[PDB]
From a paper:
Assuming that Mtb SufS-SufU functions such as B. subtilis SufS-SufU, then Cys40 in Mtb SufU should be the residue accepting the persulfide from SufS. This hypothesis was confirmed by the crystal structure of the Mtb Zn-SufU-SufS complex, solved at 1.65-Å resolution. In this structure, the SufS-SufU complex is in the (SufS)2-(SufU)2 state. The Zn ion is tetracoordinated by three conserved residues in Mtb SufU (Cys31, Cys67, and Asp42) and the conserved His354 in Mtb SufS. The structure of the complex shows that His354, which is located at the extremity of an alpha helix and points out of the surface of SufS, is inserted between the Zn ion and Cys40 in SufU. The imidazole side-chain forms a coordination bond with the Zn ion on one side and a hydrogen bond with the carbonyl oxygen of Cys40 on the other. In contrast, when SufU and SufS interact, a sequential molecular mechanism ultimately leads to the accurate positioning of the SufU Cys40 side-chain in a cavity in SufS near Cys373. We estimated the total displacement of Cys40Sγ, from Zn toward Cys373Sγ, to be ~14 Å. In agreement, in the Mtb SufS-SufU structure, the electron density map at Cys40 revealed an extra density that could be modeled as Cys40 persulfide (Cys40-SSH). Taken together, these structural data identify Cys40 in SufU as the sulfur acceptor site during the sulfurtransferase reaction with SufS. The structural study of Mtb SufS-SufU revealed the essential role of the His354 residue in mediating the formation of the SufS-SufU complex via zinc coordination.
Author numbering:
A (entry chain C): 4 to 151
B (entry chain A): 3 to 152
C (entry chain D): 8 to 417
D (entry chain B): 8 to 415
Write the structure that this text describes.
Amino acid sequence: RLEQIYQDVILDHYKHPQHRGLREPFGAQVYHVNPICGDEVTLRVALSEDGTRVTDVSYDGQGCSISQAATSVLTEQVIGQRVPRALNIVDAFTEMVSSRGTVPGDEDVLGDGVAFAGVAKYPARVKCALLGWMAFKDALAQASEAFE
Amino acid sequence: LRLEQIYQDVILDHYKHPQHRGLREPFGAQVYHVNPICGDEVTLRVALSEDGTRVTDVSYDGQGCSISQAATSVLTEQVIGQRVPRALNIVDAFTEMVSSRGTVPGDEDVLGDGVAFAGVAKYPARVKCALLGWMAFKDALAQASEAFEE
Amino acid sequence: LDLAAIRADFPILKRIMRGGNPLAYLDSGATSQRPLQVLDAEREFLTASNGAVHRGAHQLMEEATDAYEQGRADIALFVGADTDELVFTKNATEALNLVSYVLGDSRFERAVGPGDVIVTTELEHHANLIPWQELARRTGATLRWYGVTDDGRIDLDSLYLDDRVKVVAFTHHSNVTGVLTPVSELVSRAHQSGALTVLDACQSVPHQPVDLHELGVDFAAFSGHKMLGPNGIGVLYGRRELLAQMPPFLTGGSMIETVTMEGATYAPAPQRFEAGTPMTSQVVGLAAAARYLGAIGMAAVEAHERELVAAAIEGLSGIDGVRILGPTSMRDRGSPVAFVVEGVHAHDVGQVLDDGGVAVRVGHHCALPLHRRFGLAATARASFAVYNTADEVDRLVAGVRRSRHFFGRA
Amino acid sequence: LDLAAIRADFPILKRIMRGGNPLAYLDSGATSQRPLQVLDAEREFLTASNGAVHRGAHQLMEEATDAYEQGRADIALFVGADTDELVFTKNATEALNLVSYVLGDSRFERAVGPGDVIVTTELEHHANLIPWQELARRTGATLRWYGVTDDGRIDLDSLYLDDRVKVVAFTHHSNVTGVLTPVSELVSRAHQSGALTVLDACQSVPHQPVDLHELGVDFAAFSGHKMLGPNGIGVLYGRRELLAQMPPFLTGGSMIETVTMEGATYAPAPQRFEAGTPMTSQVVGLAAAARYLGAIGMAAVEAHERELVAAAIEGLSGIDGVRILGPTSMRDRGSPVAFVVEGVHAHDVGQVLDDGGVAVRVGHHCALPLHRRFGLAATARASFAVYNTADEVDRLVAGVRRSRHFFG
Ligand SMILES: *Cc1c(COP(=O)(O)O)cnc(C)c1O
Ligand SMILES: *Cc1c(COP(=O)(O)O)cnc(C)c1O
Ligand SMILES: [Zn+2]
Ligand SMILES: [Zn+2]
């Protein structure tokens, strides 16, 4: 069907969301809201003892299938990764969803992330998809500042 | 010639040789009016008779275009010596003619040389030029009448 | 009403949307569509008579000035105002800001200060809330508000006015609950303290007969682009006697009577409130919109919209887990219909509707305090115009049912 | 440039006036005429993509939002700003008012108060004068002004360095004398007191290349309807770093970050300064006007207008008893040409020109203190646009001779 936008990976993460619920420890906490009125997230990032790897992404808040599925998929891609590799994946995701139909995304880099390719064609919903990703980007930058 | 139809001889004559120019004493009211069409201005006085029933003088100074200055000159010739209510009726006939967009030619029996401003009406921007002295007079007359008794 | 003939006036209504279906535009609450009579009145002006207004003395200046001041007169007749009681702004929001700033100006005898109370409502669009918060902030006045009833009406029991109350601001017609407010009661109450009334009429002027003299409000704001008219034009109504007492808000050319480097004196109303080149061709368009609606008849417009609203409430009410924000009756109610789908986020409901070509607004509709009062982060909102149909309401109901099936709720 | 091709774009220029002559429109300084690309860009948008901007999430909202923000990008490119440094207002006047109100706001660090000085100029249009008078009235700041030289230029020798100066507001390009101002010197002087600069660019943006970054001004205002664009759209430029520090002016929907009954927090610039539904179709039309002018090229527009201006100055100066208000020299000079006819009131001069189909403005052109400085009640003003012609200048000169004959 012409949804397509609503891919099985997206419905799957919405029904069965990964890493939901704020956990401790954490090194920074952020609160982000969709410019499109109706989605929000509180998101925590914990870093390793040496500050080099993301050990946890925990979050809460309410939103649409696309905002909540995007945030679940984020946590799957980024937890246990080197900070620079986490940063690269966020850039890859942002480039794909922001491209209109133009960038398919690389599944080696994004994993289930590429399922959000269909959203690019619907620019109002791109903001739904980005909420948790830009929230993680904020919280990561803050957690790395915290570290030193 | 369209230009001659707005700029009638009476207008060019009063413009070139204006009547009752220059502020005089005595007077009952003084007003200052400015044309929204930035460039025309009048300081105008009205004197009433001892019994308050007649306009005995209209004195004025200021600066403006052929139409604003000619109209004030013609105004003074029409209302000097007239009963206050007759002066008021003459002003209303003048305003109705020039505001008429050319549908009212005016009655020369009521307006005299006033009728020469008929051709102004179809130039709505120039209507404010013609009305400057007449609305100045209407204001000053109502202030001079109120001033009188007491 | 000849609905087919009216719809034929609006070129956009023929548009095939990305999913393959003709547009069903149910978002006139946000912005209305334009009939050819409006588009053509503005284009004819622009290609024939475009010149400066009230500035110089050439032929095009006279035609433009005639079009501007006749448009003001046409719009005043439509809303039961005198010509001189209308002020043109960029939007209704600016109209409310203008009142909020003049009410803080030391040169206005009804200016608010410490000890004074400004009253608004928890029902309001943000345009009829934030400017009052800012007026309170600048002056030291304080802000109070009516709450909202469980059926989305102004709760008149929630606030007692007292002599400190100087301003009472409220909606004529809610842009979310569709409630028609009790104007004569609120005016009567405001008058017990000699308070000024400010009426947000953005959703009344396009949808029902409006007579601003009758309503007896001090100020009213409305929006051109919601009543079939151009973008870039809002309207402030002020009682002639109040406008005459007010200092200017925005200053500049055309609103002055004298000027030196040291100071200025200001023109009479409404020119006092119109600084700089006005939205000349947009006055022409909005006048054409007022004449268009006048010719249909606003009673006939209201009756048609009320039929669509009632069918929408009936159809959505019949879906399991759908609830209306606002009355489920038609008592003192019009457009729009805002609703929640249990288990389906408004963003998802709106995406499913849009896939069918049905355009609804999703979010808080610029009325977040209202949503928060009902514990809601967003609603879907079907608003209606004279050009909408019962068949489009059926498509709305089908799309909401589809959104429940698609998201596995049933 | 193909002048005949350019004129073929403007339906109104074919009009036959009441005196029986084709229009000679010499009043673009008050408002400009619209080419088909601008009329059609707006109408195509309204009949296809008209939806709310940044509100909801349906297809028409996406198209309307794309058109709004692409229009902001197109206009910013045209004036050498970044996209995020342009704020849409109903007119240039409102843009100068916005700055004049934020400069009195307790929440702005650079706001003025008692002991502070605001500087404007005696050359200014009223839009760049009255808001400074009002800001002085509200805050207790002092107003001062540059004077005008005998040739109608800003008199740089008329004010001196004063640490109290916090705001300097000045024209880029006079709407009466046509003088092009020494922006670089005025900015350098402003910086010596840490003053903010406010550039009135209403007569530069339509008439010459403008690069607002290059100019180094803090703020600039210009008017859509003067640059072949729609009515109802002005632009405020503000340096990014400054807009970020600035509290809102108009408040309401679309400009908030959070709201409760108790208070609100505000969106970033430029959304912070756009309260309520914007002039969405007018942005589309103004972007089309910027593309139109950009396709001719603003150097080519200025060269053409300077040819017409010189011909007007030289032809009118050839009439006994006709005086220019502003320089006869073309040094640092462009549109328009304001003049007095000895012994013939400006209203009578304009009426004779109008009888011949030539539209000029008569009066003070919204710059009364400038006229007063020269002891003038009113002037006639011929202003020039890319569509005007040498033959229209000849008709202007002929009409002014006719006015001398008719009244002389
Ligand atoms: C036109 C003009 C203004 C005012 O612009 P609006 O669009 O009328 O508000 C200000 N300054 C100058 C120099 C102008 O020519
Ligand atoms: C649309 C609307 C506003 C704002 O009008 P704009 O034209 O966006 O400025 C204010 N109040 C209500 C009730 C509205 O529906
Ligand atoms: Zn969402
Ligand atoms: Zn005159």
